[PDB]
Design a binder for these strands. Structure first.
Lengths: 159, 292, 208, 33, 172
RNA sequence: GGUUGCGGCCAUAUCUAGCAGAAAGCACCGUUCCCCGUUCGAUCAACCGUAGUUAAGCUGCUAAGAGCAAUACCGAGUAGUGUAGUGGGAGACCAUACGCGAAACUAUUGUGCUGCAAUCU
RNA sequence: CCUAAGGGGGACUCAUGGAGAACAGAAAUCUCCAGUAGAACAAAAGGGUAAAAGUCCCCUUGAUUUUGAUUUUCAGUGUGAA
RNA sequence: GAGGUAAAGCGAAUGAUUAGAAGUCUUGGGGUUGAAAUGACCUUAACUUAUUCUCAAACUUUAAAUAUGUAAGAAGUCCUUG
């Protein structure tokens, strides 16, 4: 007999972290979520109300609704050959702001600051990020660092 | 014969509670229920009336919670009462009422809701909530946080409750925990509550003790004796103070006999300092050598 | 009764131990893992000789028992029962299953026996003895090798007895007062913890 | 007279014999014989 | 500082607990409760069996024993009244490692109360809980903590205090 | 800098055994008329701040302390693993090529930081 | 299966071990200390829970009314459940 | 961001498991002490302490590789105020 209940296979996913059981620290309840915020979903096993399904554990989405104790998050899930928009109601204990927003929102500010200064100096600045390039030429000094010769070592048993 | 319990594995797997729970000071269940705000009232804070009693002091603070820590809006302490004319019994039920009234008036002064929301100017002990004025700002809403202190009908925390409510703050409450509440006949005897507001119980103890046990009366009510304060003029001490509390509720800090730097320099002399790594290494080497 | 060992030679299944889920499991044929003078002190037997696996393989408890008996018999016959301490280093914890003891329907088997799952380079048997007793102990293990399937190597250890220290580091820690007897094994000095207890337990500790 | 009763603090809901009450764990009360 | 001869280190009785474990429920337990209310002047409380034992003739939640706690001067008076029956002679194996001691009388009329044939005689159990000032630390709600090692009550201190305050003997 | 009230992170904060603690605070501490709660004013309630004490709590310091935390020419580029071959081997398995890469272990260092308000030799 | 074993609030801390107290003993009741949960939470197993979700006490019927949205199984149909 | 598989671990929890050593038996027996004292001794077996060999699909503090969610702007960012 197969069993396919709602929380099947969540033995380790919904467990609390080691030495982290019990009450929720209240910064979780002091965070403010606005429509359009990007949030990570991670089910807290100790709060069983407003709990996400195991599919959304580890997914990231857009807040579309804000209620008394919960947020509505939009998730795109693959069903066959397309994506379906899923609307999940989650209590804020299972939700955290995505840290990818704060990094990109800082690059927007930095680009704006760099661009305005270049206009003040009448010069140009390039704001596109670049991949790591192959390193240039260089000269290796050997004063105090004369090359040491290594050889493969013979076989030994150490038991 | 039995297994030693405090093993290294016992300590390794032990999960210490929250720092302020292990101190036995914060009830985080109640704190979560008090602090958490409706998520659609995004950054609007909930304001708590923190009321704490020490052996010598009454602390009343209006607090809003933030991620970096709680932020005090205003604060009134019982040791401020001598400025207002109450010098003894700084932990009466009536001192609690006075502290609540003071913090309410001070907060309303800070906000600007003084002329609007004056409160109960003629304290008769009736149960009443600060009702909003039509076509005007709503009264400052504050929730009572009694912490770990037990809820009993007649407790002093509800004295600060009644004082703050009469001071013009909107603090949601019921009258079934006030002194003078008849639990069998579910109505509040406002006469006994008014008695408690103006030190009536203390004055009656003074009068009842003076004619029965004068020696105990001399020790318990010393300050009243050297102040020539009898029972019949106890009430005015509170009754005037209320008026005085309403006349100038602004906070006047105590003038400090020394500066911050002087306090720090004085205190730093009586603070032992951690041994350097070399010092304890030398101690270990000496202890080894003296072992031969 | 027993199928040929070739039917259970390879680690094809996940480990299947006794648990609350399989309970009617027979006992392993091997019950004794320490033979010879197992109470000898560490200093009495400096030489260690291993029988090492060159196979990722399963060894039945029957083979473990047979090899143990063969090695013990030979070494006690040639050098005496107190000239060595033999230790079997693999315990059979994996349960083999048998089906026949219809067709393929409902074919989940019943417990049939026990086997130890050994890796490449895993020590099967260890023998601590004196140096002068080398050629005997080796010949004791070389016979025991015949009771096992696969390839095994007889390797003379670099270490002192069953200790994790080389035969030179042990002597250094011994003349420095950092080693005390514990019956058949030893305890080594620690530079951590209560200084007074450490000093009391190792009085001859020449501190540097 | 009033009749208050001692309240229950334990959680053992089972109505059975308790832990560590075995026979032969006791000494010989008649060892003096 | 850290003076052992400090005023607040004074040993004194915290409470005296009087136990009568009559094995049954009904008239005998009610009369034992009457005896306890007579001796202490306080309404006692009845204890229920935690589980069923056929050998002892008790069953779970059957009201078996009755006990009462007395504190203050009355505890001291009852304690010395019971020590009179013991003729002021306890044993070294009557004091616990935590500094408490107890004894057991066998007839409750030796204490000095009127005997009634209807009531009969019940034995009685005496236990004294010793403690210094500051035990409220371990019993208060807020900021509850433990008592420091020097402030703890132990067997030797309680034995010496008992010998001094009652001029009695602790038979080692 | 100490202390209190309310906290954030939730042991670098816990645990064991010792020692010290000026000022204020906190605390223990005293009492039972009153509101209130108990078998018990022990807890809880109220009253006095008066009679006393730093003994305990609390705070800090000590320990080749237990635990915890962090780091690393520590182990170890090891174990494992993605990709490849008409590679080896009877097989079990293994080596090599282009990549990713632990855990234990070992050693060293540390042992709460901090927000708001009030207060203090 | 459950008018509580549902809902709210309050108070308390569990399994177990050690040391003590007449009968009383390995197991009755009382006391202190230790006790990160080694207990309990109707019923399988897993997860969750310590000033509680456990134990006890007080009050109750939100196990109510109206009809939408959403998650799982999914065809993104029904039913069940949330 | 999420994960708990490979590996690893077991002088870390749970469960399994080999060997000694040192202590306590006061809440194990046999023998030997006693004209009787439960008050010693020899022994095995128990526990306790620090160690020791080996393990887990339905164990675990730790924890990959591969695979997997989101973001990388004009429907954006900032300023003022309806």
């Amino acid at each position: 007999g197969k069993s396919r209940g709602y929380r099947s296979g969540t033995r380790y996913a919904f467990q609390r972290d080691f030495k982290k059981h019990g009450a929720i620290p209240l910064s979780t309840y002091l965070k403010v979520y606005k429509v359009g915020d990007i949030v990570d979903i991670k089910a807290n096993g100790s709060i069983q109300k407003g709990m996400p399904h195991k599919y959304y554990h580890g997914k990231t989405g857009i807040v579309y609704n804000v209620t008394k104790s919960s947020v509505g998050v939009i998730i795109n899930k693959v069903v066959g050959n397309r994506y379906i928009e899923k609307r999940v109601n989650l209590r804020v204990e299972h939700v955290k702001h995505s840290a990818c927003r704060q990094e990109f929102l800082n690059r927007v500010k930095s680009n704006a600051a760099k661009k305005r200064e270049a206009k003040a100096n009448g010069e140009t600045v390039y704001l596109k990020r670049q991949a790591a390039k192959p390193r240039g030429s260089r000269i290796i000094s050997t004063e105090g660092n004369i090359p040491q010769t290594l050889a493969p070592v013979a076989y030994e048993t150490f038991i | 014969m039995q297994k030693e319990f405090r093993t290294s594995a016992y300590h390794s797997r032990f999960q210490t509670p929250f720092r302020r729970r292990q101190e036995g000071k914060t009830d985080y269940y109640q704190r979560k229920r008090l602090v958490t705000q409706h998520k659609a009232k995004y950054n609007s804070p909930k304001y708590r009336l923190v009321v704490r009693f020490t052996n010598k002091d009454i602390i009343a603070q209006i607090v809003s919670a933030h991620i970096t820590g709680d932020v005090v809006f205003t604060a009134a302490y019982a040791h401020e009462l001598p400025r207002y004319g109450i010098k003894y019994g700084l932990t009466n039920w009536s001192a609690a009422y006075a502290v609540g009234l003071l913090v309410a008036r001070r907060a309303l002064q800070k906000l600007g809701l003084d002329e609007t929301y004056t409160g109960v100017e003629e304290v008769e002990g009736e149960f009443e909530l600060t009702e909003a004025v039509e076509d005007g700002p709503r009264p400052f809403k504050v929730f009572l946080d009694i912490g770990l202190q037990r809820t009993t009908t007649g407790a002093r925390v509800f004295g600060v409750l009644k004082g703050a409510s009469d001071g013009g703050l909107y603090v949601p409450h019921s009258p079934n925990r006030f002194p003078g509440w008849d639990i069998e006949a579910e109505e509040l005897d406002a006469e006994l509550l008014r008695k408690y507001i103006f030190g009536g119980h203390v004055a009656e103890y003074m009068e009842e003790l003076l004619d029965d046990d004068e020696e105990k009366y001399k020790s318990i009510f010393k300050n009243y004796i050297e102040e020539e304060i009898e029972s019949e003029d106890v009430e005015e001490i509170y009754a005037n103070a209320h008026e005085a509390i309403r006349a100038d509720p602004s906070f006047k800090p105590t003038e400090k006999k020394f500066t911050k730097e002087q306090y720090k320099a004085e205190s730093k002399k009586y603070r032992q300092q951690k041994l350097t790594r070399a010092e304890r290494q030398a101690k270990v080497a000496k202890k080894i050598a003296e072992f031969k | 009764a027993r199928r040929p060992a070739r039917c259970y030679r390879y680690c094809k299944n996940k480990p299947y131990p006794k648990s609350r889920y399989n309970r009617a499991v027979p006992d392993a044929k091997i019950r004794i893992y320490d033979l010879g003078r197992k109470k000898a002190t560490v200093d009495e037997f400096p030489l260690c000789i291993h029988l090492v696996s060159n196979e990722l393989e399963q060894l039945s408890s029957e083979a473990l028992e047979a090899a143990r008996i063969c090695a013990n018999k030979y070494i006690t016959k040639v050098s005496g029962r107190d000239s060595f301490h033999l230790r079997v280093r693999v315990h059979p914890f994996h349960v083999l299953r048998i089906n026949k003891m219809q067709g393929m329907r409902g074919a989940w088997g019943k417990p049939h026996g026990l086997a130890a799952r050994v890796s490449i380079g895993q020590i099967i048997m260890s023998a601590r003895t004196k140096d002068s007793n080398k050629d005997v102990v080796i010949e004791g293990l070389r016979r025991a090798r015949y009771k096992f399937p696969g390839q095994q190597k007889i390797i003379i250890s670099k270490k002192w007895g069953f200790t994790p220290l080389n035969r030179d580091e042990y002597i250094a820690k011994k003349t420095n007062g950092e080693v005390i007897d514990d019956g058949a094994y030893v305890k080594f000095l620690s530079r951590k913890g209560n200084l007074e207890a450490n000093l009391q337990q190792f009085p001859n500790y020449q501190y540097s | 007279p009033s009749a208050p009763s001692r309240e229950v603090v334990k959680k053992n809901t089972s109505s059975k014999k308790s832990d560590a009450a075995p026979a032969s764990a006791d000494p010989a009360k008649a060892k003096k014989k | 500082s850290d003076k052992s001869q400090n005023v607040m280190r004074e040993l004194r009785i915290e409470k005296l607990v009087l136990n009568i474990c009559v094995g049954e429920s009904g008239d005998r337990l009610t009369r034992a409760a009457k005896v306890l209310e007579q001796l202490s002047g306080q309404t006692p409380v009845q204890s229920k069996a935690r589980y069923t034992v056929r050998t002892f003739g008790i069953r779970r939640n059957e009201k078996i024993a009755v006990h009462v706690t007395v504190r203050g001067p009355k505890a001291e008076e009852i304690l010395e009244r019971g020590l009179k029956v013991k003729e002021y002679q306890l044993r070294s194996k009557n004091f616990s490692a935590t500094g408490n001691f107890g004894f057991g009388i066998d007839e409750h009329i030796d204490l000095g109360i009127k005997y009634d044939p209807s009531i009969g005689i019940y034995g009685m159990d005496f236990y004294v809980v010793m403690g210094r000032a500051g035990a409220r630390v371990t019993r208060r709600k807020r900021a509850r903590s433990t008592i420091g090692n020097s402030h703890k009550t132990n067997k030797e201190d309680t034995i010496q205090w008992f010998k001094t305050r009652y001029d009695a003997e602790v038979l080692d």
